[PDB]
Design an enzyme around this catalytic site. Structure first.
Site, PDB file in Angstrom:
ATOM      1  N   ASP A   1      21.942  18.559  20.813  1.00 40.93           N
ATOM      2  CA  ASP A   1      23.392  18.599  21.691  1.00 40.93           C
ATOM      3  C   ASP A   1      23.630  18.338  21.008  1.00 40.93           C
ATOM      4  OD1 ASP A   1      25.056  18.044  23.975  1.00 40.93           O
ATOM      5  OD2 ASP A   1      24.131  16.076  23.842  1.00 40.93           O
TER       6      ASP A   1
ATOM      7  N   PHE B   1      20.180   9.475  32.687  1.00 43.09           N
ATOM      8  CA  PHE B   1      20.073   8.730  31.469  1.00 43.09           C
ATOM      9  C   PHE B   1      19.536   7.845  31.039  1.00 43.09           C
ATOM     10  N   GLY B   2      20.599   6.715  31.400  1.00 42.15           N
ATOM     11  CA  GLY B   2      20.723   5.338  30.448  1.00 42.15           C
ATOM     12  C   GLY B   2      22.092   4.602  31.196  1.00 42.15           C
ATOM     13  N   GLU B   3      22.755   3.388  30.528  1.00 42.03           N
ATOM     14  CA  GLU B   3      23.219   3.127  30.197  1.00 42.03           C
ATOM     15  C   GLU B   3      23.122   2.001  28.496  1.00 42.03           C
ATOM     16  OE1 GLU B   3      24.072   0.872  34.770  1.00 42.03           O
ATOM     17  OE2 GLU B   3      22.471   0.524  33.750  1.00 42.03           O
ATOM     18  N   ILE B   4      24.384   2.300  28.614  1.00 44.06           N
ATOM     19  CA  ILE B   4      24.475   1.741  27.546  1.00 44.06           C
ATOM     20  C   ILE B   4      25.859   0.497  27.533  1.00 44.06           C
ATOM     21  CG2 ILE B   4      24.918   1.866  23.989  1.00 44.06           C
ATOM     22  CD1 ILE B   4      24.421   4.783  26.878  1.00 44.06           C
TER      23      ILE B   4
ATOM     24  N   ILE C   1      29.109   0.051  27.719  1.00 41.35           N
ATOM     25  CA  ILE C   1      30.351   0.935  26.661  1.00 41.35           C
ATOM     26  C   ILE C   1      29.876   2.042  27.267  1.00 41.35           C
ATOM     27  CG2 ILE C   1      31.117  -1.200  24.711  1.00 41.35           C
ATOM     28  CD1 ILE C   1      28.903   0.189  23.242  1.00 41.35           C
ATOM     29  N   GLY C   2      29.143   2.517  27.792  1.00 38.42           N
ATOM     30  CA  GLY C   2      28.092   3.661  27.911  1.00 38.42           C
ATOM     31  C   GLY C   2      27.327   4.329  29.822  1.00 38.42           C
ATOM     32  N   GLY C   3      27.556   4.891  29.791  1.00 36.45           N
ATOM     33  CA  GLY C   3      26.655   5.284  31.381  1.00 36.45           C
ATOM     34  C   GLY C   3      25.995   6.529  31.311  1.00 36.45           C
ATOM     35  N   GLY C   4      25.027   6.722  32.426  1.00 36.22           N
ATOM     36  CA  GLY C   4      24.751   8.155  33.371  1.00 36.22           C
ATOM     37  C   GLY C   4      23.406   8.088  34.105  1.00 36.22           C
TER      38      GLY C   4
HETATM   39  C1  LIG Z   1      19.527   5.202  20.295  1.00 33.90           C
HETATM   40  C2  LIG Z   1      19.791   6.732  20.715  1.00 33.90           C
HETATM   41  C3  LIG Z   1      19.734   6.633  19.293  1.00 33.90           C
HETATM   42  O1  LIG Z   1      18.944   7.930  20.724  1.00 33.90           O
HETATM   43  C4  LIG Z   1      21.252   6.831  20.931  1.00 33.90           C
HETATM   44  C5  LIG Z   1      22.329   6.781  21.682  1.00 33.90           C
HETATM   45  C6  LIG Z   1      23.280   6.912  22.255  1.00 33.90           C
HETATM   46  C7  LIG Z   1      23.650   7.348  23.498  1.00 33.90           C
HETATM   47  C8  LIG Z   1      24.444   7.699  23.443  1.00 33.90           C
HETATM   48  C9  LIG Z   1      25.421   6.413  23.924  1.00 33.90           C
HETATM   49  N1  LIG Z   1      26.728   6.073  23.992  1.00 33.90           N
HETATM   50  C10 LIG Z   1      27.881   5.283  22.607  1.00 33.90           C
HETATM   51  C11 LIG Z   1      26.659   4.817  22.288  1.00 33.90           C
HETATM   52  C12 LIG Z   1      25.161   6.283  22.570  1.00 33.90           C
HETATM   53  C13 LIG Z   1      24.486   5.982  21.821  1.00 33.90           C
HETATM   54  C14 LIG Z   1      26.729   4.200  21.313  1.00 33.90           C
HETATM   55  N2  LIG Z   1      25.623   3.603  20.493  1.00 33.90           N
HETATM   56  C15 LIG Z   1      26.257   2.666  18.938  1.00 33.90           C
HETATM   57  N3  LIG Z   1      25.611   2.300  18.181  1.00 33.90           N
HETATM   58  N4  LIG Z   1      27.121   2.595  19.136  1.00 33.90           N
HETATM   59  C16 LIG Z   1      28.254   2.920  20.077  1.00 33.90           C
HETATM   60  C17 LIG Z   1      28.220   3.779  20.809  1.00 33.90           C
HETATM   61  C18 LIG Z   1      28.963   3.767  21.505  1.00 33.90           C
HETATM   62  C19 LIG Z   1      29.682   4.140  23.115  1.00 33.90           C
HETATM   63  C20 LIG Z   1      29.066   4.720  23.347  1.00 33.90           C
END
Ligand SMILES: CC(C)(O)C#Cc1ccc2[nH]c3c(c2c1)-c1nc(N)ncc1CCC3
Ligand code: NA
Ligand code: NA
Ligand code: NA
EC number: 2.7.11.1
Length: 288
Positions: A132, A23-26, A19-22
């Site tokens: 940021d 740093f790392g991935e989500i 659901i996300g990515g770049g």
């Molecule tokens: C560990 C911490 C607090 O540093 C962090 C972080 C974080 C960085 C990048 C992110 N990109 C996205 C999310 C996200 C979180 C995301 N995070 C959550 N919890 N729910 C939904 C989403 C939506 C999908 C996109």
């Protein structure tokens, strides 16, 4: 760390999709124990600059604060580092852009500003700058108890500004955040302070209400810094509530060392709502 569908982390978190990515991935994953879906953020075990550890430390430090995701778990292994946290919903940049004119009403802007200000004061209260602050790093809740609350995300650029209190600033510090919302001080390589997170909030709220910032179409960081340095920021407030002049003058007056008057900024928002009859239980713009 490109984890396939139905991959399972520590016998508990079954990846559903990226659901996300770049740093790392989500990833959105299913918690096989508690049966809710969660956010699973990963960092490659080989990538050089490893910040996920500090992200976890800030997130743990903030547990119990409003506008902060629940910490669910974390782990370091041979292939990747990870943190599991509460899953949130739509982010504010996407919500703003889905509005017909790319703007929020003043009611939604002011009420979001109150929550984002609370978030910023929270991370500062535990000794860290976010560095940021931007609308895609705030996401609205997705539960009956949270859908009118927004949540602060992405501590990857955070920096501790206390020693054990206010840490000695570097003479000149590099800027690595998002150009559009960065303060002049961040552009001028000054060590960032609590006031520079509040500058990002100021710029965010102007963009929410007006729909654009003057330097949005300039992608040259150095050019954008010179534009902000020369810009008459009171021009930003021509169609904003006049109390915002108080917020601008306050953050303009601050240096790295001085604690912001968060309460003064909160009262800007609260007084702006009272002048206009705006109630805290009004529908947000995206609510139909
Ligand atoms: C560990 C911490 C607090 O540093 C962090 C972080 C974080 C960085 C990048 C992110 N990109 C996205 C999310 C996200 C979180 C995301 N995070 C959550 N919890 N729910 C939904 C989403 C939506 C999908 C996109
Ligand atoms: Na079930
Ligand atoms: Na949602
Ligand atoms: Na939620």
């Amino acid at each position: 760390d490109i984890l396939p569908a139905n991959y399972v982390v520590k016998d508990r978190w079954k990846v559903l999709k990226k659901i996300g990515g770049g740093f790392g991935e989500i990833y959105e994953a299913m918690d096989l124990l508690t049966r809710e879906n969660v956010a699973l953020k990963v960092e490659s075990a080989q990538q050089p600059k490893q910040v996920l550890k500090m992200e976890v430390a800030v997130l743990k430090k903030l547990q119990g604060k409003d506008h902060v995701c629940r910490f669910i778990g974390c782990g370091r292994n041979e292939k990747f580092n990870y943190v599991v946290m509460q899953l949130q919903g739509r982010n504010l940049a996407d919500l703003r852009r889905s509005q017909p004119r790319g703007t929020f009403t003043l009611s939604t802007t002011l009420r979001l500003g109150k929550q984002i200000l609370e978030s910023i004061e929270a991370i500062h209260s535990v000794g860290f700058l976010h560095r940021d602050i931007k609308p895609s790093n705030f996401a609205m809740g997705r539960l009956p108890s949270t859908y009118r609350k927004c949540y602060m995300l992405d501590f990857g650029l955070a920096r501790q500004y206390t020693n054990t209190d206010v840490r000695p600033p570097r003479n000149v510090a590099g800027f690595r955040g998002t150009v559009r919302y960065a303060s002049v001080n961040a552009h001028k390589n000054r060590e960032m302070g609590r006031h520079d997170d509040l500058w990002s909030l100021f710029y965010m709220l102007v963009e929410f209400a007006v729909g654009q910032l003057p330097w949005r179409k300039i992608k040259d960081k150095e050019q954008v810094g010179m534009i902000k340095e020369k810009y008459e920021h009171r021009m930003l407030l021509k169609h904003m509530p006049s109390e915002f002049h108080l917020f601008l003058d306050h953050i303009a007056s601050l240096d790295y060392f001085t604690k912001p008057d968060y309460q003064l900024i909160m009262s800007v928002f609260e007084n702006s709502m009272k002048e206009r009859g705006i109630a805290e239980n009004e529908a947000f713009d995206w609510e139909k």
